[PDB]
A paper describes a structure:
The Isw1b chromatin-remodeling complex is specifically recruited to gene bodies to help retain pre-existing histones during transcription by RNA polymerase II. Recruitment is dependent on H3K36 methylation and the Isw1b subunit Ioc4, which contains an N-terminal PWWP domain. The only domain annotated within Ioc4 is an N-terminal PWWP domain. The Ioc4-PWWP domain preferentially binds H3K36me3-containing nucleosomes.
In order to further our understanding of the Ioc4 PWWP domain we solved the crystal structure of the Ioc4 PWWP domain at 2.3 Å. Analysis of the structure showed a high degree of structural conservation overall when compared to other PWWP domains. In common with other PWWP domains the Ioc4 PWWP domain contains a highly conserved, antiparallel, five-stranded β-barrel at its N-terminus. The α-helical composition at the C-terminus of the domain is also maintained, although the number and precise spatial relationship to the rest of the domain can vary in individual PWWP domains. A unique feature of the Ioc4 PWWP domain is the presence of an exceptionally long insertion motif (aa 27–110). Close analysis of the Ioc4 PWWP domain crystal structure revealed the presence of one acidic and two basic patches. The basic patches apparent on the Ioc4 PWWP domain consist of a series of lysine and arginine residues. Residues K149 and K150 are in close contact with the DNA sugar phosphate backbone which explains why their replacement completely abrogates DNA and nucleosome binding. Similarly, the insertion motif is in close contact with one of the nucleosomal DNA gyres, thus potentially stabilizing the interactions between the PWWP domain and the nucleosome core particle. While the stretch of negatively charged residues within the insertion motif is not resolved in the crystal structure, it seems likely that it interacts with the positively charged histone tails and thereby provides further stabilization of the interaction.
Residue numbers in the entry: 2 to 391, 393 to 415, 465 to 547
């Protein structure tokens, strides 16, 4: 599906993807390059499993917190803007997408959750979470409720959990300590206990989700919701008379939203990196590109200084920014998805009554500390199943140092092997690889989507079943069942 000459773009379903697709059409009009914007379910979960397959996007949009994990797994291409372009965006938005000294994406916009409230039902929103049980009593008498927001995603409940001292990873001396997790300390427990009590006393329901909360507020059934800038569009349509303001305090301390930077990363496996850079820098990251997206669904405070000086007059933006300053910029470290999943499970189990607050958070604490497992990155000397198309044939990835010069010339448009002989590793996925087939000795250039890692257990399973009835592939599989240790790759290149 991904192929040279075209762009496939993924962005989340709550973002202004029709607006983004209008920028895509402008790009297609001027350049002839087709742009397809998609918004699949669970895209932040899917990207790592399909980035190296034919089903990956060239460009992925998400909050920066997922991008450290992607980069550690080699899925993101390094971004290389000159000083002039960097000067166009705020420094702190670049740092959000800096990973191990490298720029790993283009920042787009800054997102924080705010308290949104119906100015008709409630001209004086509570400054404190504590006021809300009594406020809901009063509103229940009038056929309404005080507050509804998405309880299925920890993003929305984290500000309350963090208010009295909950945190993700301890930050000191400019680095995150991954073994110091603040998920089950007395503060986090206090905040999640408050949430569960709101449920128990019937002021909120445990299965309220994004669209339930959205419909409810937009129809005037609830005085308040908690949401981001992307949601202001549908409230405008509603003609609910609404304000956007600072989240309530908990035990006198501000709610502390995790702040996100919507960012666009480029798939390291993509053959369209230069096109992707042209689209992002020259079409999206301009006043008119960003405006088209923002008029579909508000971006928040954009990273682009020129367009932001316009947007910054909006009091809804100022409120976002105030909440952002009371919260934390999310870490981009690879441990973040394990943290999010751990806390997601904890909140859903506690709110539903399926587990206590103490036991839910204690399990989340240990889970959030699990060692991060990066996706493997195709390396030279790796043993693969390679498709000439052409049927899949066992082969070895050849390092550039060993590639016969004639074969180099046909290339598409350190691992220490020996004290003197070292192979530069692949830092990321590549758009093309030079492999050499076993018991065949021919070379080919392949895309990653046409390679699959081949283990020895893979070989046996093949050499044990009905697949062995295909005789021509037996010596191939049985050379590769040896593993890369059992093959002198210098010999294999030199003499077959
Ligand atoms: O709830 C966990 C989730 O939080 C954040 O996801 C946000 C995203 O940043 C926003 O742009 C918006 O779309 O809502 C999402 C939550 O529904 C993290 O970015 C994400 O990694 C995390 O899993």
């Amino acid at each position: 599906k991904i192929e040279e000459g075209k762009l496939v773009i993924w962005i989340n379903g709550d973002k202004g993807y029709n607006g983004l697709a209008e920028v895509g059409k402008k790009f297609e009009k001027d350049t002839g390059i087709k742009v397809t914007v998609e918004h699949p379910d669970k895209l932040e979960e899917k990207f790592p499993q399909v980035a190296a397959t034919g089903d990956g996007p060239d460009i992925i949009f998400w909050a920066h917190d997922r991008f450290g994990g992607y980069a550690q797994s080699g899925l993101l291409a390094e971004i290389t803007p000159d000083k002039a372009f960097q000067d166009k965006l705020y420094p702190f938005t670049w740092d959000a997408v800096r990973y191990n000294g490298k720029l790993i994406a283009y920042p787009i916009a800054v997102e924080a959750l705010s308290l949104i409230y119906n100015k008709d039902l409630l001209p004086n929103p509570p400054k404190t979470w504590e006021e809300i049980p009594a406020l809901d009593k009063e509103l229940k008498a009038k056929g309404k409720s005080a507050l509804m927001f998405n309880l299925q995603e920890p993003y929305f409940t984290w500000p309350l959990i963090a208010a009295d001292g909950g945190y993700a990873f301890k930050y000191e001396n400019g680095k995150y300590d991954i073994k110091d997790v603040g998920v089950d300390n007395a503060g986090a427990k206090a905040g999640l206990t408050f949430l569960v009590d709101l449920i128990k006393n019937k002021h909120m329901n445990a299965d309220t989700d994004y669209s339930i909360a959205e419909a409810a507020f937009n129809k005037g059934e609830t005085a308040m919701t908690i949401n981001g800038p992307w949601a202001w569009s549908n409230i405008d349509t509603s003609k609910v008379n609404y304000g956007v303001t600072v989240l309530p305090t908990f035990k006198g301390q501000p709610s502390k939203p995790f702040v996100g930077v919507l960012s666009a990363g480029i798939n390291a496996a993509s053959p369209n990196k230069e096109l992707a850079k042209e689209f992002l820098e020259n079409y999206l990251l301009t006043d008119e590109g960003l405006e088209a997206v923002n008029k579909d669904k508000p971006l928040g405070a954009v990273a682009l200084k020129s367009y932001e000086e316009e947007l910054a007059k909006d009091p809804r933006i100022a409120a976002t920014m105030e909440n952002a300053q009371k919260g934390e910029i999310m870490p981009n470290i690879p441990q973040m998805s394990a943290f999010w999943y751990a806390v997601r499970t904890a909140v859903i189990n506690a709110a539903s009554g399926r587990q206590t607050v103490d036991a839910a958070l204690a399990a989340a604490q240990t889970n959030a500390a699990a060692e991060f497992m990066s996706e493997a990155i195709f390396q030279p000397t790796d043993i693969v199943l390679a498709k000439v198309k052409g049927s899949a044939w066992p082969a070895m990835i050849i390092p550039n140092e060993l590639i016969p010069d004639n074969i180099l010339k046909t290339k598409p448009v350190f691992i220490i092997y020996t004290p003197v002989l070292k192979f530069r590793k692949n830092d990321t996925l590549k758009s093309t690889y030079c492999v050499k087939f076993f018991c065949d000795d021919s070379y080919i250039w392949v895309k990653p989507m046409d390679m699959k890692i081949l283990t020895s257990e893979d070989c046996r399973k093949w050499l044990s079943g009905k697949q062995r009835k295909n005789k021509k592939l037996i010596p191939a599989y049985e050379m590769a069942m040896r593993g890369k240790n059992g093959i002198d790759i210098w010999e294999f290149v030199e003499y077959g």
